[PDB]
Design an enzyme around this catalytic site. Structure first.
Site, PDB file in Angstrom:
ATOM      1  CE1 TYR A  17      34.886  34.316  35.047  1.00  0.00           C
ATOM      2  CE2 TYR A  17      32.672  34.097  34.078  1.00  0.00           C
ATOM      3  CZ  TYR A  17      33.998  34.523  33.984  1.00  0.00           C
ATOM      4  OH  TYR A  17      34.429  35.123  32.828  1.00  0.00           O
ATOM      5  CG  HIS A  22      36.659  38.222  41.369  1.00  0.00           C
ATOM      6  ND1 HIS A  22      36.918  39.149  42.371  1.00  0.00           N
ATOM      7  CD2 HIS A  22      36.674  38.882  40.166  1.00  0.00           C
ATOM      8  CE1 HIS A  22      37.093  40.328  41.771  1.00  0.00           C
ATOM      9  NE2 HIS A  22      36.956  40.203  40.444  1.00  0.00           N
ATOM     10  CG  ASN A  69      35.446  44.062  35.441  1.00  0.00           C
ATOM     11  OD1 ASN A  69      34.678  43.165  35.050  1.00  0.00           O
ATOM     12  ND2 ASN A  69      36.753  43.883  35.567  1.00  0.00           N
ATOM     13  CG  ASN A 111      38.717  46.676  38.553  1.00  0.00           C
ATOM     14  OD1 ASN A 111      39.168  47.839  38.535  1.00  0.00           O
ATOM     15  ND2 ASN A 111      39.465  45.579  38.419  1.00  0.00           N
TER      16      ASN A 111
END
Length: 194
Positions: A17, A22, A69, A111
């Site tokens: 990531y 994000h 999330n 989320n």
């Protein structure tokens, strides 16, 4: 006189990531820690954190390690542990509702944010720092966009945002806005054009 602040940025941990859209909240949090000289070695409640202060104000900066999330699995208990009042829980995260690099500060979609909300007993009255990442394009769905790295042009804006967000965090926490946060929000939007 003990009312620490919890500064948490959201994201997904791992090389996988790293640099993605994000994970912007993680970038911001690495930035604040760095600037303040706070090392995030500590692993508690499914998160990595560091402790220090902003000026005279004691804070904890955190990067949940439970995945986007489920951020609430970390924040909720973390806040309780350190006794951080709702009003002092500052969440930083990526927002598709705002164009790239526009920050937005609010004190009352995503989320990670719903789950955090969920764990704070649904309470919503905490401050949040949104970092815009723009709208995704309607093909490979709005899902690889977030799991993708920022184009170079976008980085420009992003890097500028990291710098201004660091300042915004220090003002909210220690300084004082010296206008309403809404005026800061207005200036952000305008700056997107300059």
């Amino acid at each position: 006189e003990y009312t620490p602040w919890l500064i948490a940025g959201l994201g997904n941990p791992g090389n996988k990531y790293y640099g993605t859209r994000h994970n912007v909240g993680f970038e911001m949090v690495d930035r604040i820690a760095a600037e303040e000289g706070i090392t995030m070695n500590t692993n508690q409640f499914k998160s990595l954190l560091g402790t220090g202060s902003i000026g005279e104000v004691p804070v904890l900066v955190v990067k949940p390690q439970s995945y986007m999330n489920y951020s609430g699995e970390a924040i909720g208990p973390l806040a309780a542990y350190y006794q951080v009042p709702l009003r002092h829980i500052l969440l930083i995260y990526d927002d598709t509702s705002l164009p790239n690099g526009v920050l937005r500060l609010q004190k009352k979609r995503h989320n990670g944010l719903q789950n955090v909300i969920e764990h704070l007993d649904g309470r919503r009255e905490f401050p949040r720092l949104s970092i815009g990442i723009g709208s995704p394009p309607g093909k490979m769905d709005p899902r690889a966009f977030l799991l993708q790295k920022f184009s170079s042009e976008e980085r420009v804006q992003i890097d500028t945002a990291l710098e201004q967000g660091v300042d915004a965090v220090r003002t909210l926490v220690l300084k004082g806005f010296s206008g309403s946060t809404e005026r800061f929000n207005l200036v952000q939007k305008l700056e997107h054009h300059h």
